[PDB]
Amino acid sequence: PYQYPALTPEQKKELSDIAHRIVAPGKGILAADESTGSIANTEENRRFYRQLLLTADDRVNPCIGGVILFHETLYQKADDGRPFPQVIKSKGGVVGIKVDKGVVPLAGTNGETTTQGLDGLSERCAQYKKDGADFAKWRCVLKIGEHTPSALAIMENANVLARYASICQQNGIVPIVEPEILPDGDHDLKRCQYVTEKVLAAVYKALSDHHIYLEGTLLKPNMVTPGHACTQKFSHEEIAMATVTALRRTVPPAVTGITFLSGGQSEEEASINLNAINKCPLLKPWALTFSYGRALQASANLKAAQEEYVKRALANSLACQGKYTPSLFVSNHAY
Amino acid sequence: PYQYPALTPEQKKELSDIAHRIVAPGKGILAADESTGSIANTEENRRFYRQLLLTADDRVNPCIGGVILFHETLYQKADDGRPFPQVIKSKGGVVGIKVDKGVVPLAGTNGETTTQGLDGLSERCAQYKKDGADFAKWRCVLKIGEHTPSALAIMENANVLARYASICQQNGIVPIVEPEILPDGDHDLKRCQYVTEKVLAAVYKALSDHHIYLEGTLLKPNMVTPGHACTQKFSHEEIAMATVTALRRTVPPAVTGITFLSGGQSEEEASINLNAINKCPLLKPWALTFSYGRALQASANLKAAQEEYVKRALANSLACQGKYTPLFVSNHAY
Amino acid sequence: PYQYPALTPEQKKELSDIAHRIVAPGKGILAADESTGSIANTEENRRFYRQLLLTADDRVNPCIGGVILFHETLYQKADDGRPFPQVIKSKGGVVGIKVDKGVVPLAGTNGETTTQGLDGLSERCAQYKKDGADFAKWRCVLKIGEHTPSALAIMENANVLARYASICQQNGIVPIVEPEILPDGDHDLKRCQYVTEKVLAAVYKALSDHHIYLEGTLLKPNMVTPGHACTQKFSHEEIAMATVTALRRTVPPAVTGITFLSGGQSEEEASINLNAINKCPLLKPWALTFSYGRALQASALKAAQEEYVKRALANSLACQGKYT
Amino acid sequence: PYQYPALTPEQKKELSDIAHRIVAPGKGILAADESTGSIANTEENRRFYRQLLLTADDRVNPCIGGVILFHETLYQKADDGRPFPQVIKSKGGVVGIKVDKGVVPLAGTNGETTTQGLDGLSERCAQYKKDGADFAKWRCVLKIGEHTPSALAIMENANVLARYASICQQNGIVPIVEPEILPDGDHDLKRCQYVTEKVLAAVYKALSDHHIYLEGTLLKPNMVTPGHACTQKFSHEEIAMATVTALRRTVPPAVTGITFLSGGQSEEEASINLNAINKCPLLKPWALTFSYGRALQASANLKAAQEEYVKRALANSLACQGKYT
């Protein structure tokens, strides 16, 4: 192996600085990047809704290190003329942009997918950087079943994530690597922990093969939870131990932060589990915070709605510090 | 591993049939798929030049089993109004379409590239199959150097080729897999053979990992030649033995045909080397024919130009049959 | 990738020549390398039974290109005073030696195994060569199940096979690569074909990765067949087509020959399937012959020898497509 | 991926506990596992040399968390008749055993090696455990050159280390994973950093593929240094930072400890660099201590030589806490 350095020290410093800004203590990410099809529905109601979240009062400023936007929102303005990226920065936030182009089927699999979006991505990134964005989001989707995720699905999704990260970093953009393992199915907590550990190991091997600068990245994994259709109830402390155990086994300390997606978890469930993860009594050498979409937005008449959002922002700000409130076989040796 | 079949029996039969039609004995491929930048320049002149090649007299019919078109040409028409895809089929040819969107650089490498174009590919393939295409081409480019091609370069290009092939086959399109090792640099014959063998082994492992149906594919490799800056001359017999040896070591017999690219070779070297390849006294369980662009078009006033092309197409139809003519030397030395 | 050549032209020619001798037209392999635990049981009875096969009448000579021996047998003598490797060679055979040291469990799997035996293997291979052997055999074992063979089991067995092949070829020994997929289970023909295809692709990627010279190797795979408890009926034609299709999709033409293991098949079944494989109307750019143990030995002094000669003769015809 | 668990909670507990004992605060490893060929020379002199080290003053007990032995020494006895493993345990140490059988050439490479010793290793581990050993060592060797370490050499050494690790853990033995990158050559600090990073990423991917329990393992890597013939000068602070950065990019936090090999460094250089490593300001979620042979033994008349070893033990005990002038 012979190095042709991907990044200069200045580019590295820029990327590490951004990543640390996003996940600073008490800060997490508003995921407002739903597509037109997802948000469903007119361009003005979309703009007004974004404006509602993005202009909530200043209690949110210390809670929100970053906001992920959809391409359209990135180019809209608030009522006062200010471009939404300027609104976010003026409140202490970093602007992010979703850059993938959705999932597509893998032939020869049981409905597994990879994600597309690499074509002309460098030129898109360079333009987004100019237009005020400093980090990006790309979502791969995996499913636990009898024979999934398959080796093909794991390899290909990890490979496309590494390509995406590489292109972003060449453009001054911090990549959020999102390998979402879906909660569908009847598998228990142990099986989710196992699959998560295998998927993340493949992701970090791929990132290394593609020469990624881990200090200028973030990870957006699922928490480790039973399948939606498992009927065994698991405690918040078990969810936290399994999640932190899987992360400790796979995620190098150099990764700057881990911004959990919420999945199907209610607003309060998502805050409680994030808090439990931060109280877990194992060494956790990275920020453990939130990148929540619906679990920050569901309770969010203009001013009432904003209060609902601020309340959840404040709650998760506390949870990502362990400060939130709403025998061998129980020890960490059982994970 | 647990199989979720990618293709039905009927889909497979369609792909294998198309693949065999393209490389039927005596037949090869005209690669007319140069982009606008490459072909350099008006659309009229581009259209006229392609009509010139596609409407040559009926003697090319038995020589050309397929033609690769650039996107714009798939939708153009000759002077009589016939769409170029109907002109090609009426002369016995299969219509192909280049689908990649060019190379891009890999960060952290010595200027190595991968190739883009997967986004929306499936929709484009279904459209092209509708407008008369039955196969496709996708080009990856590797370069030999002190530290290249790197493991990353080999892995990534083999992977994207496999993705492209999978998508095509879902849409009834035979993919031509083209992992081109450039002839640039000062490396000798043996070094080209070594790198070709390592690359193709990675290509076919990727095709297996992605569940590709090899009988419904073609391979478009470089011949094994010295680098352009190597001053040791190598004989036609040596180029043939190294090429066939590297292929025998990596390419499953299930593959229906191998359609060489010509690289920097002259029109005549390309025919001579193709012929020597077909005369090589080792077992070759696949068609060994041509997918030539410049090596069919350089020499090609309408009628004289059309005559230079016909001549080359005839020379290469003979060459892909071995019928052409204008210890250390043994196969254990390879 | 940068080459530091593993073999000289002289070394390649020696390996290619050995490999072509073993699988020359009409010839196959007698697999007589049953371990002492397997053959069960004294040393004299073992020597005598091995002598029974190796000294069979010279009508067997055009049928037998190679004989695979267990370590003990390589160092024994026939009644007439001659070392068994001398007996084999005088009948036109190449002498082969089993060099693996059995399977071991892979932790974290459902009863899956890899194979051990690499320690000291180069020194052993140099001695076996000196003592008359020109090819070797190493057996890996995979099992089709709900979650097997797993990625680990395929990768690890492909890697150990390639290590063994590398070491053999450094000592002038042709390696027979044996990735056996067991017939155990009720899976159908097509599942076996799919797994075989996936395993063989991994095998040949690994051989490439370890710089193996394929022209100086042989492959010993399972035929592609339904699982032992499968409830569906399948013709020889179908078994032949599935098998030849899997191989055409995975085995480079440079491989000199494919010497099938008989598995659980009867003497006559293995011959009929081998004949049908050779009649399959598809391009097959390698020798397709037999490396049979029980399928040559079961029905097998002069009367027993004759039954082995008859199966030798039958399989000699089958590996040419000429067996009624 | 479908799990067939390799270890029970009880097995995991035992392995984690052993691992944490070896690398507890202020503790490291005496690597006394030289083969008869390396330690070259009578059986009796070998026994006396190792006796000298193993029975040094109780002042070393807080410094030494484990001792790696060669097979021969595991079955020798001190002058008072005590098995050496009992001498080590009574001084508060964990007993280790070298179980590899040396390197072998990889054909088709530029003199690169892999390591052998897997045959019958499970049976060897179960017996060593019975005879008092609780951890093991296996050494792979890689070389930095114009075209090395090659992909084959990295993939193959990572795979054999994982096989080794799997077998040990099945037998209650904590595996020390030693992928040594040699300092030979004139490459710079960053080249060593880059290759170390690529190698460790392959090592941990392999351990994952083989279902290794990382909390029940230790890593024994080279520090990241310039090549022995490099013409550029580097400070201890730079060596520490390059080393810590390499490890942070590759080693999961679940790994219990990293016990450095001294690889050609002098007694004092190895202490200073270990101290600098422990003072590096970045987050370091594993123990960073020593697994030293010559760096603990070179200066080590019985009582005078024993004192030279005790002093190095004390120096490195401080250094693995960042507390050594």
From Swiss-Prot, chain B:
The keyword Nuclease does not apply. Thermal denaturation midpoint (Tm) is 54.4 degrees Celsius. It is an enzyme of class 4 (lyase). Pfam families: Glycolytic. Belongs to the class I fructose-bisphosphate aldolase family. The keyword Phosphoprotein applies. This is Fructose-bisphosphate aldolase A. PANTHER family: FRUCTOSE-BISPHOSPHATE ALDOLASE (PTHR11627). It comes from Homo sapiens. The modification Phosphoserine is found at S35, S38, S122, S262. It is linked to Glycogen storage disease 12: A metabolic disorder associated with increased hepatic glycogen and hemolytic anemia. It may lead to myopathy with exercise intolerance and rhabdomyolysis. Pathway: Carbohydrate degradation; glycolysis; D-glyceraldehyde 3-phosphate and glycerone phosphate from D-glucose: step 4/4. The record marks Y334 as: Necessary for preference for fructose 1,6-bisphosphate over fructose 1-phosphate. GO terms for molecular function: actin binding; cadherin binding; cytoskeletal protein binding; fructose binding; fructose-bisphosphate aldolase activity; identical protein binding; RNA binding; tubulin binding. It catalyses: beta-D-fructose 1,6-bisphosphate = D-glyceraldehyde 3-phosphate + dihydroxyacetone phosphate. It is found in: Cytoplasm, Myofibril, Sarcomere, I band; Cytoplasm, Myofibril, Sarcomere, M line. Changing D119G: In GSD12; thermolabile. In vertebrates, three forms of this ubiquitous glycolytic enzyme are found, aldolase A in muscle, aldolase B in liver and aldolase C in brain. Keywords: Acetylation, Cytoplasm, Disease variant, Glycogen storage disease, Glycolysis, Hereditary hemolytic anemia, Hydroxylation, Isopeptide bond, Lyase, Phosphoprotein, Schiff base, Ubl conjugation. Catalyzes the reversible conversion of beta-D-fructose 1,6-bisphosphate (FBP) into two triose phosphate and plays a key role in glycolysis and gluconeogenesis. In addition, may also function as scaffolding protein.
